[PDB]
């Protein structure tokens, strides 16, 4: 027992290589990699690694496990055991649903507490920036937030208030001025509520219908307008799930400029058009919503070409009651996916799209580390970071059935979909954390 | 047998310039004839040899307050302006006058009020304001050019601005209705958070306004009405832009399909921050004057194309209301609307070589093409209306208070040297102006 585990005989891949090696961890950090099979048999536990691929540990900066308030909506417990079976050794929990919203230094504490004896896996928290918490802002940077949220449009649960534009230009000053980031959800409140009331009178209730209430326009206004505010503020911004190329060129077009912005997307604009929202129904439902398959197709061009920052979940589950309505404008809308986010990403973009497994690192690991101030501690391999990874099957098919789900509840628009790469094992800074089967 | 004959000038068209006289027939033209064709009797003349005939230039951005604020200008002080700066025909703003243009009933007390004072022809804008979309059919059909809305805090105080919510109902309606929505542009919330910061920290000067109001807050407000307008398939007017920045992106807006115009006035082209200090205070507007190569990007985006039409911006007030302790204290708005041909014959023509037939289409025709008065305004041609104005070129001279026909003479081109006078203007017919 000269080290506490050893990874034998993997190949290592990265945000920019791929290698066979043995992975030696010692206290919980990376202490020795090595050519597969020099360190001695007799020298620590191993986990057989032959014929596996060992990705660093993914980073998902947005999930919403709603503990607590409306706890029996996830849970840390089940939410941080879904990620383990994904892949996912960081997660980003936040500050909304979670009720009442991480809106406070107080509130934090008790929501890190909870974490901190029910979390699998390793946790950091979204900060909430609502119309009223500008003076709580410098004591959630303190409290250690890596970064904050506000919302540009009414969503779900009308106790976390959205932003109107004096809020998100007082507290931007104020982020900037903590050296912190404010992550937005980009859609334009009066665009969606005024097209959602005339679609509601004319009883058009289609899941195309509901995408046209919330179009690629106005998350164009949205992101226009809060790129605006980012370049008289300078306070670094982050834009949560875009659906479409148009909204990344248009961030392109910002970057290029020197405005201080990353884009996430989610990876059910990347597996679901407007069709697969037809047959799937309600589960499928998510703001911004699911775009037609053209639009999907563009949105892949753009992650290819390198137009997409990071990939995260936006997993937001709820009481399978809740998904059940009177029409597709009824249902709490979100999509239960943080276990199958490396899943879609390894079926559809590494073995259908030909993506390489170095870009699925660091969409899904590397980025979210880097854009957060957690690099290179989290999202590589290498001697001194945290000894978080994971271990996958490249070539493993699946049809993934409900009994796999870790979520509270076991439903999903996944649910009947074939994978191929499943993640065998998952370790959390050091500790052996999931094994399949 | 002529009602009038227009005699030996340089006609000066959108795209032309010919020597030939016209001939004017019940407020139109009849004939457009050779040098010397009709004979001296066939009736009265006016000597326009050595000169160069415009046509009519049509002013869309003027306030001339009445009724309600008569006393900061009024239809009669404001006309007899424009006429002396060779203008023809105006479109009056709904705002500033008191009650502002809401409903028809507060549009025709100010339409025959017209009827008695102005000298040359006018048309009227619309207001939209929180929430008046009753009134905005009723407006229509009583016969208004087009609609104005502000996204910024301003006006005096009731003629409030339109947010996300009233923007779009009223652009969905005036679509509809086939006309057209004028914006000021500019970003409230970005507008009095910068004001309030610049206050408190004792920043005072010229600059520090210019700051308050920035140009990123005119491109915010103005990418939020081109999406709103792309939603709604509502025609789209950006008033006074002062940067080639906000223009750039008006140009991209262009190329993706937005049916959007865009206008800058004489001030942002003449005046800078240097001059804005200068001058001092007379020199405010919104959007304020900005830096020396921000004026300069103007004028190569004018020269390029980017700029629809110009218009005055005739935004006027008392003597004593350009009086406060601060750059923020003051109402802020330029009188100018005598002098805007003026500005753009000196700056352009003389000083940065552009051609006289981008004058005339800035000035007079696109501002007729843009709201549906062409070719019955904007042109020389036989049917139009004979709505003209000559112009001795060369001639130089100094403005003072003395020379201006506004209710109140003052103004922050009094002092400036221009080359180019108006000395005759024609307006439907009858000769409407004679300089000496
Ligand atoms: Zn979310
Ligand atoms: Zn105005």
Not at 209 to 233: G, H, K, N
């Amino acid at each position: 027992k000269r080290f506490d585990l050893i990874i034998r005989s993997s190949t290592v891949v990265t945000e920019t290589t791929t290698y066979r090696a043995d992975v030696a961890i010692r206290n919980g950090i990376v202490s020795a990699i090595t050519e597969p099979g020099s360190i001695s048999s007799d020298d620590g536990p191993a986990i057989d690694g032959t014929g596996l691929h060992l990705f660093p540990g993914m980073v998902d900066v947005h999930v919403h496990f709603n503990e607590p308030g409306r706890t029996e909506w996830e849970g840390f417990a089940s939410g941080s055991k879904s990620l383990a079976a994904g892949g996912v050794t960081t997660y980003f929990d936040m500050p909304l649903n979670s009720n009442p919203p991480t809106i406070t230094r107080e509130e934090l504490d008790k929501k890190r507490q909870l974490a901190n004896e029910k979390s699998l896996v390793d946790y950091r928290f979204w900060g909430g920036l609502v119309p009223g918490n500008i003076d709580h802002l410098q004591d959630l940077h303190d409290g250690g937030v890596i970064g904050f949220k506000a919302f540009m449009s009414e969503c779900g649960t009308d106790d976390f208030q959205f932003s109107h534009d004096e809020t998100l230009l007082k507290g931007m000053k104020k982020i900037a001025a903590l050296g912190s980031i404010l992550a937005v959800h980009a859609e334009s409140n009066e665009m969606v509520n005024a097209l959602t009331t005339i679609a509601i009178e004319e009883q058009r209730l289609t899941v195309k219908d509901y995408s046209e209430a919330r179009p690629i326009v106005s998350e164009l206004e949205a992101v226009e307008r809060i790129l605006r505010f980012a370049q008289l503020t300078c306070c670094p911004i982050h834009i949560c799930h875009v659906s479409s190329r148009k909204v990344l060129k248009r961030i392109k077009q910002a970057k290029g400029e020197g405005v201080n912005v990353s884009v996430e997307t989610c990876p059910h604009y990347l597996l679901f058009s407007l069709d697969e929202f037809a047959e799937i129904g309600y589960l499928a439902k998510c703001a911004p919503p699911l775009r037609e398959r053209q639009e999907v197709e563009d949105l892949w061009d753009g992650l290819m070409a390198g137009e997409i920052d990071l990939i995260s979940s936006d997993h937001s589950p709820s009481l399978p009651q809740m998904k059940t309505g009177k029409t597709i404008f009824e249902v709490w809308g979100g999509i239960a996916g943080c276990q199958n986010t490396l899943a879609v990403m390894l079926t559809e973009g590494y073995h259908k799209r030909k993506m390489p497994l170095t870009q699925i690192v660091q969409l899904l690991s590397t980025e979210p580390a880097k854009r957060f101030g957690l690099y290179p501690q989290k999202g590589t391999i290498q001697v001194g970071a945290e000894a978080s990874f994971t271990l996958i099957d490249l070539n493993e098919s699946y049809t993934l059935n409900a009994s796999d789900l870790y979520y509270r509840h076991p439903i999903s628009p996944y649910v009947g979909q074939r994978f191929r790469g499943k993640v065998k094992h998952t370790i959390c800074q050091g500790k052996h954390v999931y094994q399949d089967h």
